[PDB]
Amino acid sequence: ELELDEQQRKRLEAFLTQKQKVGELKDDDFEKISELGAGNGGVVFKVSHKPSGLVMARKLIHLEIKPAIRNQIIRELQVLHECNSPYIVGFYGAFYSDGEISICMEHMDGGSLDQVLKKAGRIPEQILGKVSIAVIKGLTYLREKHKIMHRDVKPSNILVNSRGEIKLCDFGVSGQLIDSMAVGTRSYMSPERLQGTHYSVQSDIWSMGLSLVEMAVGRYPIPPPDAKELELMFGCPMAIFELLDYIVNEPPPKLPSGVFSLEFQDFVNKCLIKNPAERADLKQLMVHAFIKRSDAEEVDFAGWLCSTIGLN
Numbered sequence: 001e002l003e004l005d006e007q008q009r010k011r012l013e014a015f016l017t018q019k020q021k022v023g024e025l026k027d028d029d030f031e032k033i034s035e036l037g038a039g040n041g042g043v044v045f046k047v048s049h050k051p052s053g054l055v056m057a058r059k060l061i062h063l064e065i066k067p068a069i070r071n072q073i074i075r076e077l078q079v080l081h082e083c084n085s086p087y088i089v090g091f092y093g094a095f096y097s098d099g100e101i102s103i104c105m106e107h108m109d110g111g112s113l114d115q116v117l118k119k120a121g122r123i124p125e126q127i128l129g130k131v132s133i134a135v136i137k138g139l140t141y142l143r144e145k146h147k148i149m150h151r152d153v154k155p156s157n158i159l160v161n162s163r164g165e166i167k168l169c170d171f172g173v174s175g176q177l178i179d180s181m182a183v184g185t186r187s188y189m190s191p192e193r194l195q196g197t198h199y200s201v202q203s204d205i206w207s208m209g210l211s212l213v214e215m216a217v218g219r220y221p222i223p224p225p226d227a228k229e230l231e232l233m234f235g236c237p238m239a240i241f242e243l244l245d246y247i248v249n250e251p252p253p254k255l256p257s258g259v260f261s262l263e264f265q266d267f268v269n270k271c272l273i274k275n276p277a278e279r280a281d282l283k284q285l286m287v288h289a290f291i292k293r294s295d296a297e298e299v300d301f302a303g304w305l306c307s308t309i310g311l312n
């Protein structure tokens with residue numbers, strides 16, 4: 001599942017060749033083009049790297065900490081130069097400057113899936129089959145090649161582009177950056193992680209499953225939509241601490257029946273089993289009926305995406 005396509009192998013080669021031409025990244029070398037969005041502790045800009053002419057996405061994480069500390073995150077982040085996969089957002093470099101840490105990456109012109117979902121309303125099952133393949137492959141890659149688990153799968157961390165690529169970002173490559181930060185939503189965290197118990201890649205599988213249900217139905221799915229909400233949805237509020245308690249104590253969300261294929265409902269159900277030991281693992285998901293069916297479908301993801309977000 002980590003074997004590269006010809007077109008994929010080529011795109012990777014092109015990104016690396018371009019990358020080699022970029023030297024050490026420095027603050028003054030960037031011109032801001034626009035604001036891509038912001039989280040609970042970071043802002044992201046679309047920027048031009050003046051010298052190279054490359055357009056990048058630059059994330060600034062404003063953090064006030066001794067030169068000692070900062071210099072350590074920069075060190076761990078250097079691992080990103082080794083994360084090369086069609087399913088992982090490309091990295092250019094990381095530097096510290098005037099209080100904030102900068103992480104420069106490949107700009108994804110389709111933005112993140114939370115943005116796409118807001119535009120689309122809900123994302124069709126066949127499109128989510130391709131998204132599922134990408135996420136599982138991206139997680140397999142991180143695990144196999146870098147012994148890293150993502151730790152923060154959610155729609156805003158899956159990015160897409162007009163070429164039809166789907167990629168993960170914001171994965172836990174640096175332990176120190178994770179600690180020095182660590183308030184990001186806990187709303188996609190597995191029950192085991194919320195309970196302080198057992199967490200491995202199994203926990204990313206839960207987050208992917210919950211993210212797929214949200215994108216399929218068009219709404220964060222906890223607590224479940226009542227009969228009349230589903231009726232308006234297809235024809236066919238809780239405070240954060242209340243929501244995390246719900247996740248730990250109540251049965252997992254599921255897709256509504258009768259609108260999605262049984263293979264897709266079964267796939268999400270296997271990702272959402274509360275017991276991480278019973279929950280499917282990457283190897284099992286890679287050969288799940290829904291994944292095999294989706295891999296065989298010729299889905300024009302870029303055409304769907306471009307039409308939907310009005311790209312162009």
Ligand SMILES: Nc1ncnc2c1ncn2[C@@H]1O[C@H](COP(=O)(O)OP(=O)(O)OP(O)(O)=S)[C@@H](O)[C@H]1O
Nearest residue numbers: 037038039040042044057106107108112156184185
């Ligand atoms: N490489 C990139 N290309 C295009 N858009 C990007 C890229 N990286 C980030 N973005 C956008 O920038 C937004 C802000 O990113 P983040 O600061 O990581 O916040 P978030 O992921 O939305 O929320 P938190 O901080 O985890 S709660 C994302 O939601 C994406 O829409």
Ligand SMILES: O=C(NOC[C@H](O)CO)c1ccc(F)c(F)c1Nc1ccc(I)cc1Cl
Nearest residue numbers: 039040041042059089103170171172173174
């Ligand atoms: O950025 C991260 N989380 O979201 C930040 C949010 O803005 C906080 O509110 C993050 C967390 C831990 C870590 F180890 C990283 F490497 C991170 N960033 C990160 C990882 C891979 C790539 I390719 C690009 C980036 Cl940027």
Ligand SMILES: [Ca+2]
Nearest residue numbers: 026027028097
């Ligand atoms: Ca400067």
Ligand SMILES: [Mg+2]
Nearest residue numbers: 039156157170
């Ligand atoms: Mg993010």
Ligand code: NA
Nearest residue numbers: 027028097098
């Ligand atoms: Na600056």
